[PDB]
Amino acid sequence: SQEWKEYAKRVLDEWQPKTKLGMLVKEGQITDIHEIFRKGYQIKEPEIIDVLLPEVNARENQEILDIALTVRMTDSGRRVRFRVLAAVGNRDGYVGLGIGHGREVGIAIRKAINYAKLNIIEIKRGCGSWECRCRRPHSVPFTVEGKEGSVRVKLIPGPRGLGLVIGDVGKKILRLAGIQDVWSQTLGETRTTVNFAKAVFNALYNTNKVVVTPEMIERYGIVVGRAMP
Amino acid sequence: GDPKRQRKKYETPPHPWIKERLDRERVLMDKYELKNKKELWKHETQLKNFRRRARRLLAARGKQAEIEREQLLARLKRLGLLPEDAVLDDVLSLTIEDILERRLQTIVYKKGLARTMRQARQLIVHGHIEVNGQIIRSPSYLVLKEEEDTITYARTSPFANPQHPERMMIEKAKQ
Amino acid sequence: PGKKAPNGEFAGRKLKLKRKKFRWSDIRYKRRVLRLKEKSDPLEGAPQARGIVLEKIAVEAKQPNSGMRKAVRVQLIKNGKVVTAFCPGDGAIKFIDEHDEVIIEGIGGPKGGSMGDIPGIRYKVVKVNRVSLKELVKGRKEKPRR
Amino acid sequence: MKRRPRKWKKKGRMRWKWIKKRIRRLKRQRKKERGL
Amino acid sequence: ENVELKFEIPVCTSCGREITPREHATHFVCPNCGEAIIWRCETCRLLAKPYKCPKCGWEGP
Amino acid sequence: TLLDPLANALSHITNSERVGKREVYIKPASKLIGEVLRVMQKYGYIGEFEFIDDGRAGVYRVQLLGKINKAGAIKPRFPVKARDYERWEKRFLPAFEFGILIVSTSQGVMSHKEAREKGIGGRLIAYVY
RNA sequence: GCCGUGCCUCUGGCACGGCUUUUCCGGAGUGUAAAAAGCUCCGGGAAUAAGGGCUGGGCAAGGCCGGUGGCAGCCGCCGCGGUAAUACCGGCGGCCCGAGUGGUGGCCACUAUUAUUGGGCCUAAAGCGGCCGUAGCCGGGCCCGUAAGUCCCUGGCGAAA
RNA sequence: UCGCCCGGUGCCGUAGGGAAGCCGUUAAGCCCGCCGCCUGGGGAGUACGGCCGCAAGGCUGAAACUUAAAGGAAUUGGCG
Ligand SMILES: [Mg+2]
Ligand SMILES: [Mg+2]
Numbered sequence A: 001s002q003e004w005k006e007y008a009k010r011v012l013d014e015w016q017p018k019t020k021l022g023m024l025v026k027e028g029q030i031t032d033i034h035e036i037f038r039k040g041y042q043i044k045e046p047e048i049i050d051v052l053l054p055e056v057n058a059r060e061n062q063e064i065l066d067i068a069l070t071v072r073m074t075d076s077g078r079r080v081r082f083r084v085l086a087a088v089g090n091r092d093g094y095v096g097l098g099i100g101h102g103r104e105v106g107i108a109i110r111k112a113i114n115y116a117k118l119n120i121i122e123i124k125r126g127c128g129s130w131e132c133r134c135r136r137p138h139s140v141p142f143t144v145e146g147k148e149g150s151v152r153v154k155l156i157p158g159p160r161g162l163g164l165v166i167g168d169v170g171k172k173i174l175r176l177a178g179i180q181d182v183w184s185q186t187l188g189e190t191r192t193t194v195n196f197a198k199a200v201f202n203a204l205y206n207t208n209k210v211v212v213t214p215e216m217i218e219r220y221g222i223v224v225g226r227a228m229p
Numbered sequence B: 001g002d003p004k005r006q007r008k009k010y011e012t013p014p015h016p017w018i019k020e021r022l023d024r025e026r027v028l029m030d031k032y033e034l035k036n037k038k039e040l041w042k043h044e045t046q047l048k049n050f051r052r053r054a055r056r057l058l059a060a061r062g063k064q065a066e067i068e069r070e071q072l073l074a075r076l077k078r079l080g081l082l083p084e085d086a087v088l089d090d091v092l093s094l095t096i097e098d099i100l101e102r103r104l105q106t107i108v109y110k111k112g113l114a115r116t117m118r119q120a121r122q123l124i125v126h127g128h129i130e131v132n133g134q135i136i137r138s139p140s141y142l143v144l145k146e147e148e149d150t151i152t153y154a155r156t157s158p159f160a161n162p163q164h165p166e167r168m169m170i171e172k173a174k175q
Numbered sequence C: 001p002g003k004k005a006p007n008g009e010f011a012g013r014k015l016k017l018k019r020k021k022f023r024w025s026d027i028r029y030k031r032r033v034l035r036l037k038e039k040s041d042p043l044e045g046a047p048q049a050r051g052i053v054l055e056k057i058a059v060e061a062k063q064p065n066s067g068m069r070k071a072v073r074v075q076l077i078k079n080g081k082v083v084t085a086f087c088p089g090d091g092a093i094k095f096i097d098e099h100d101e102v103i104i105e106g107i108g109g110p111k112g113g114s115m116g117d118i119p120g121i122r123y124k125v126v127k128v129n130r131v132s133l134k135e136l137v138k139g140r141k142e143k144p145r146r
Numbered sequence D: 001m002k003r004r005p006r007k008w009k010k011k012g013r014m015r016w017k018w019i020k021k022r023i024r025r026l027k028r029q030r031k032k033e034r035g036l
Numbered sequence E: 001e002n003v004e005l006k007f008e009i010p011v012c013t014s015c016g017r018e019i020t021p022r023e024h025a026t027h028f029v030c031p032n033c034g035e036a037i038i039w040r041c042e043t044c045r046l047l048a049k050p051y052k053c054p055k056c057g058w059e060g061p
Numbered sequence F: 001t002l003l004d005p006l007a008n009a010l011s012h013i014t015n016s017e018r019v020g021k022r023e024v025y026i027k028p029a030s031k032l033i034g035e036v037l038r039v040m041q042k043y044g045y046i047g048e049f050e051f052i053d054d055g056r057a058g059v060y061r062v063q064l065l066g067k068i069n070k071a072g073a074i075k076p077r078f079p080v081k082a083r084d085y086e087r088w089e090k091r092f093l094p095a096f097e098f099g100i101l102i103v104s105t106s107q108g109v110m111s112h113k114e115a116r117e118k119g120i121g122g123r124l125i126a127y128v129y
Numbered sequence G: 001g002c003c004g005u006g007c008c009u010c011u012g013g014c015a016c017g018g019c020u021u022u023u024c025c026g027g028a029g030u031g032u033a034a035a036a037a038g039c040u041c042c043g044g045g046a047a048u049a050a051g052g053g054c055u056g057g058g059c060a061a062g063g064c065c066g067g068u069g070g071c072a073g074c075c076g077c078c079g080c081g082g083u084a085a086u087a088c089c090g091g092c093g094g095c096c097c098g099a100g101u102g103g104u105g106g107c108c109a110c111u112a113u114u115a116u117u118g119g120g121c122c123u124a125a126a127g128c129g130g131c132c133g134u135a136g137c138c139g140g141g142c143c144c145g146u147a148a149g150u151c152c153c154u155g156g157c158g159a160a161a
Numbered sequence H: 001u002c003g004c005c006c007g008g009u010g011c012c013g014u015a016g017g018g019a020a021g022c023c024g025u026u027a028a029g030c031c032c033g034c035c036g037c038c039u040g041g042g043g044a045g046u047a048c049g050g051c052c053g054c055a056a057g058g059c060u061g062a063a064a065c066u067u068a069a070a071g072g073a074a075u076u077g078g079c080g
């Protein structure tokens, strides 16, 4: 697991930090991904993530969900623009989704991948199904739902071995976060992939708004972030 | 109403042209040298029925549901697919390449009785192997555990003589 | 609007009645229970039929298109009706002659209707003189009875 | 007459106050001219 | 991965509801005491709910 | 008009605790309401409660702890057999033991987890989780 | 059909050597009311045995060559063709299933487009112009009875397939 | 003239809801009830039948066929 540990050392030297969090990460005060989140900081440099979660840019922890091209009219023609939708994440507990625009497909992908890192979140995994009652981080620990635009999404826990039975794009997002088994129920128009993608993202975020007692944890297996890499 | 119809014992895919699945099945067919696809979906179904049984005896409780629970372990390990210490929750982490390892073809090849995998098919179909003092001529037969050691060449086969010109090319690989 | 009308415990009769009442605002159900397809259908619930051709015709295609599609008039045998049927293939019309018997299938469009730019036609020819048409179009077989 | 406000919308049609007046004249002719 | 309580999650000092990863919360040392850290969730900051230090009794915004 | 004094209470509770309140007043106070508060307490959802008399049916003061996600009434009050609970637990609750389902059994009011230990049934009145 | 060694476009085709006999032809038993199939044995021989639909997007697979010129034709839907066609018609490559593979009609899922689980009614389909009331559905707090609804235990039943 | 409680009538606005315009204790929010209506656009509020009115007219109300969109809320321009 080393090829992405010399990347961290190379970036951590020629990077001049400009915000407070960058100063902290460079001075060795902050040294783990799990302690930049629940504090109300702000993340404006993408190099806070290339140093603390280096394998986020591994080309198999990246994904391009869709590419569109859109237009605005003028008395001298049609001014064209792109729209890429990208997601990144290590397949342990951390995911991000961003969009990014440009005049060419290459610049747009770069901005998509860049903004995906700054909009990152951590989630909870477990096993809450009636059929499989193991205690292993392979699914969603309970029913959660999220929404965006006109799309409503619900995710339900499923037993170990069943695939990810959700739509065509939900698999990428749910698989970059570390899940492997789920069920699903959808309303609204699922053919606008931006709103469908943002609904699944919102559900995975809502995973951590449900109040739970300390006894439920050693019944569903709830882990937050990495679970023994 | 209507009387009984005989039904198919396999299932086709929901969509026929998914790329990431044609790519996954094109490998299992060259590694075990199965004849067509309907020969592959039959084993997937043999596994999915076990899985769907363990999901119901896992939520259920009662007197006879108990009896149905420990008949699934008993056979499922009489068939060599589980060990002698396994609890019910180990039915859910079984794989397709565990059932494809129990065909008579793959076993008569993994015991050194054939030089390759497409030759074991011919040895089974032309009637040279024997399973427990009994010629069997069907390569898809799942071998049990109490008899995966009593497998040889037929007593009346040309291969049952360590001077045959074709048997001498077989042991020439075992070192 | 309020909650929903008969959500009581002893209100089963009214709930069933509301459902049976509004199921008739459908079109796939009303058309299946009153059997409206039969009583107006020249083929009478068959997958195929047979007729005897009266004349050969040509139709004009739709608006964003150009060209003439060749067809025939068939006079059915079980009814006596007269329908209009389409001859699929490159050069097929040179194998259909008047006083011939032809077999007729649907043309496979939306809801059972017509397809593509031939808008009013809803049947197509499959067999001529007990000899398939697909063969005749591509050599491979010869046409009996002249 | 049980009319529906989708037809007062005038986009690709003529006015409905004037289609009503023309349906009424035919419902009359079918009545007098041997509507018995 | 060396789970000896690898971390814990902070909770709001007024309602006791733990804090989600990206919300507009805050924390600061207790005024008038200097000995306790005080958390406020976004929804207890938005509608100004009182808090009180768990050590002395000083109350409210 | 008024048709259900128990539904009003449970919706009041879940509306109040969602905006951050720490006390509520359940105005028309049956003893079914009190009996359901008793079992919402033993499982740790509310604090302590008292009955105040006001000359007209009395009131209930209850302190909240911010420990519930949702509470409501199962209205049509279906009956259940003593071996058919999971069919309803899969409809109202979010995982295989997440929260309680309150049942009006022939020996009082109790959660379905204590009805399955005696093996009895009854009418479902509410659910909390 | 299989195995070994070489050559080449390397997933496959060839040249040399060897092997087997499920299937195929003759023959002897057993089988059968009599036959026939089947089954156990002999003697020959790689010898007797691959189609159908697809190849622009949905949807796996070609930006290769010759024809036709808004004409022939294709098209479930969107859509191709006007003398420079990856979309029609032929050649040669390739893809999916395979003793099958395509075409037309019917029912279920798709469809939360019949909604008890579980939909809508300001502007998209849709709140009666307004109000009074008969049947029916829904109905405030406590105390004492009954045991019809409801729940648990137990006898007789709900044919075989 | 100032402050408070109850009932009507207006505006700016949190949480929340909505495809948005926008609604927001006088809900288009979260609940417990009852009744009336809706099911792609046309054909058509038509034909045939019934009941009311002195007439003009009101109320109830289909199908053969035909079509791939018809509708809504907001953007950039071009234009008056
Ligand atoms: Mg071609
Ligand atoms: Mg493709």
Ligand SMILES: [Mg+2]
Binding pocket: G119, G120
């Ligand atoms: Mg609808």
Ligand SMILES: [Mg+2]
Binding pocket: none
């Ligand atoms: Mg309207």
Ligand SMILES: [Mg+2]
Binding pocket: none
């Ligand atoms: Mg009462």
Ligand SMILES: [Mg+2]
Binding pocket: none
């Ligand atoms: Mg029976």
Ligand SMILES: [Zn+2]
Binding pocket: A126, A127, A128, A132, A133, A134, A135, A136, A138, A139, A159, A160
């Ligand atoms: Zn599990």
Ligand SMILES: [Zn+2]
Binding pocket: E012, E013, E014, E015, E016, E017, E040, E041, E043, E044
């Ligand atoms: Zn708080």
Ligand SMILES: [Zn+2]
Binding pocket: E030, E031, E032, E033, E034, E036, E052, E053, E054, E055, E056, E057, E058
């Ligand atoms: Zn203090």
